[PDB]
Amino acid sequence: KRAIYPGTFDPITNGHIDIVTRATQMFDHVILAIAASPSKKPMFTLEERVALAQQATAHLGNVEVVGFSDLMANFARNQHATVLIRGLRAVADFEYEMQLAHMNRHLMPELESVFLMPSKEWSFISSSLVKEVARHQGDVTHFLPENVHQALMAKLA
Amino acid sequence: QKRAIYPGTFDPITNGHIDIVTRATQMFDHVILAIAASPSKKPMFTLEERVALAQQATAHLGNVEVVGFSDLMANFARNQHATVLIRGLRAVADFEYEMQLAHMNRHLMPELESVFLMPSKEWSFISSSLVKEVARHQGDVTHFLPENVHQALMAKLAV
Amino acid sequence: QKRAIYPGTFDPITNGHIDIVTRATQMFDHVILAIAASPSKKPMFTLEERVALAQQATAHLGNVEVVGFSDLMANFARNQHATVLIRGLRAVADFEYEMQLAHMNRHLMPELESVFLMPSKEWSFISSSLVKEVARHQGDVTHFLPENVHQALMAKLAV
Amino acid sequence: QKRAIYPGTFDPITNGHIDIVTRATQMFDHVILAIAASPSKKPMFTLEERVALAQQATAHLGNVEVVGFSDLMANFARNQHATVLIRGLRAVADFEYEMQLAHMNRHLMPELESVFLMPSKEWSFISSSLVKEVARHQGDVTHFLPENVHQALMAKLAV
Amino acid sequence: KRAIYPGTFDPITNGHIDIVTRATQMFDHVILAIAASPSKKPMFTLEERVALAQQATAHLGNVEVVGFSDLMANFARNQHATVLIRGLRAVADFEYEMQLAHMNRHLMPELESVFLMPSKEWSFISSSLVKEVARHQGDVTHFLPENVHQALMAKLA
Amino acid sequence: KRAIYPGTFDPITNGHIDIVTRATQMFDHVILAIAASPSKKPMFTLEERVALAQQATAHLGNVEVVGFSDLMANFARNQHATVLIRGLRAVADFEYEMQLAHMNRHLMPELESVFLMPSKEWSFISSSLVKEVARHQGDVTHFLPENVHQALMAKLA
């Protein structure tokens, strides 16, 4: 049983770590798939984001971090995944996640989207929010893996 | 080896509910469709009727076990050695209640993980409540129900 | 030639409801304000009282016909040769229920099209429920009701 | 000099409610925790029980006065010379009802300003309703309640 | 009775066709009005979008496709329309549609906004979503008129 | 008792005037704090926005208009404020305001976020909406202070 947790992870946060850890307690192999998402003008390069996530997830034995620029449905097929994992935060993410999952269902009917709910600790953060706080030299230590907080400060210097 | 519970009132089970258990059977080894007595909700069908309707409507699914329960849902999942809790996600108003509910279940049973599945567009606007409402007012609900459930619902409304 | 039905409980009719039918009379040739008995809701006013209050409060509108009905709303719209179904949109929680409702009505009567009108900012936060709640607790609701309806509501609460 | 009222059913008071009054005591000179009888809601605890539980659970707060009231909330705030109306904001479904409610209170008492405080993440998914539901079904609710309230809730459910 | 269905239509989708078809069963003349919307950086030019929509709607006798860069209220007056049609998809579109309709009511009180609900088939697609799927060479045949799908592939080649 | 009403105010609207006026009836001193927000590409410069807001609020004795580019929590501390005021319009603003307030609570626990509700009159406008209407030469007289409407037309000429 193979599941994919896709996202921009720009950068990966403790909310993302929360979700991927719950996915490893539930599925045999989880692929943390980092979308290139160049339309989003990500702060970190795909190679940067893959490196940050690999280091931030190394203590989790059954997580494989991979970058990709493909269509999600094609990449899920090529990875032999039948489960797509997405974290559910708020009502505005939810409605977009539904359009997404229905689109992914259209493109790959046997690829099933499942939504996990993060801990309350991370229920109000996002990559975007942490980055804006860090641009104003605010403390984001609590929201990020050490390697990621270390790298985020270096990139904003 | 992964044991998943899909709990609910199933008053009666609908094609949306069938959609959800069928997707859950494709992900987990054993799925327990747990029918809560929910005496608080004053159900149209008895718990045995709901179990019977749910059993025959899921009978073609090899790894579904239809079971009733009157315990607190977390207390039942613990006793069933279930680690996955299945919930179907319809609209945003379901979402907000599901979130409170899942945080409560996590407090009560941290090792029980709540999982949200998404129904087909076909069933994304029906509920047991609405279907019953339409049938109480002589509206056609055949499209939303298993055949065995449509006959029990028709038979129940004649009297 | 276009026949539109605006159904609801109207328990009692409010200035928000008047806002909606008045905008509907500017778009369609004949508007049927259909008062559902909604015995399920245990209404404060009787169906004849609601019809009477609604008739006089809409009497200045030439193409409004106030009618009661106890059928399923789609069954009534079919028999009235109505092809437009008017619903007033208040807030997002109305929206989610209106969407399920309209998909149900489309299943039951495809040729009946559901249309959503938007009330004035003035009435975008009132409902029959809230107005009644405030008046049961001796609050001023004069601003939200037609004069004839405010007197029936005052008279109904004295006893 | 600023007098603030925090009204509600408090059936029973929870740690979310304590969170809100405690933040309100840090902003306003005197906070009135107003316990509405809400006979409409068929409360689990009597009004005197709710006042007593709320008094001891807030007793460490110097500028909190726990008071019961059966008037319309605006009528009570007027008589208490309160100009700030405290409401706790949980999720989006609370928001939509709070907005209608606050516009109503502004109509009834323009000089009473509604203020929305945000609870801790800890209590952002609990309510009196859900806690009671879990405890009626033999679930652990110790984490969500003041100690004095957990004993009254345990004692109330034994019989 | 004259109604306007305005939008960016970048490009027009089967959801848009759904809504405009329902409007023609309800009103005598419907003007599918394509807003230039240069703030949105549309993928297709206004002339491209007007051509695509004209061809995609030709089988509907009482639809007139027009482009415009005016203020909506002025354009509705100049077209002798008293009805503004908008399709309602999700909760996040809804709140914006309300600010819009109230603004349009302020500018032209007799111009009434009416909201139609698309079929479940199109309740989870958008121009944006289809375009992103097509950028990754995903099948969007089901969501578009043939001429529009044909043109969307050519523009992404 | 010192409260801060922060925002982009690009430009300040009658909804903003509504909220700040309610804050002055409730707190002793209100600081209308204008965030530089260069990520938003504001139409008016920070100096322009501060000038517009000062003039638009001059009749309110206990409002001090200030611009800032700092972290909100640091600026609130430096102004000796313990109250952060935000206006609540719709469900989509609400969820973002929660992530914000929880972030600000993390950074400054004693800085309490409080939400005021504007009048129905301004419950459907935004700086963004007014600006788009003014770009199409639409009447925005009703939504803005005179000095701000006067300046908005000049900037769009």
Ligand SMILES: C=Cc1cncn1[C@@H]1c2ccccc2C(=O)OC1(C)C
């Ligand atoms: C980012 C996560 C994701 C999950 N599902 C799809 N996505 C993306 C997406 C968005 C919208 C349309 C298509 C796609 C797509 O096919 O791939 C993407 C990975 C780029």
Ligand SMILES: C=Cc1cncn1[C@@H]1c2ccccc2C(=O)OC1(C)C
């Ligand atoms: C795109 C559809 C639409 C429907 N109603 C208005 N719009 C647009 C708009 C958005 C926001 C403010 C003003 C306007 C406006 O006046 O015209 C636009 C056509 C550009």
Ligand SMILES: C=Cc1cncn1[C@@H]1c2ccccc2C(=O)OC1(C)C
């Ligand atoms: C604009 C109002 C505001 C209120 N609270 C914070 N903000 C902004 C913000 C957004 C997101 C992350 C950090 C911040 C921040 O620290 O300062 C900003 C002023 C730039």
Ligand SMILES: [K+]
């Ligand atoms: K998340």
Ligand SMILES: [K+]
């Ligand atoms: K649409």
Ligand SMILES: [K+]
């Ligand atoms: K505002």
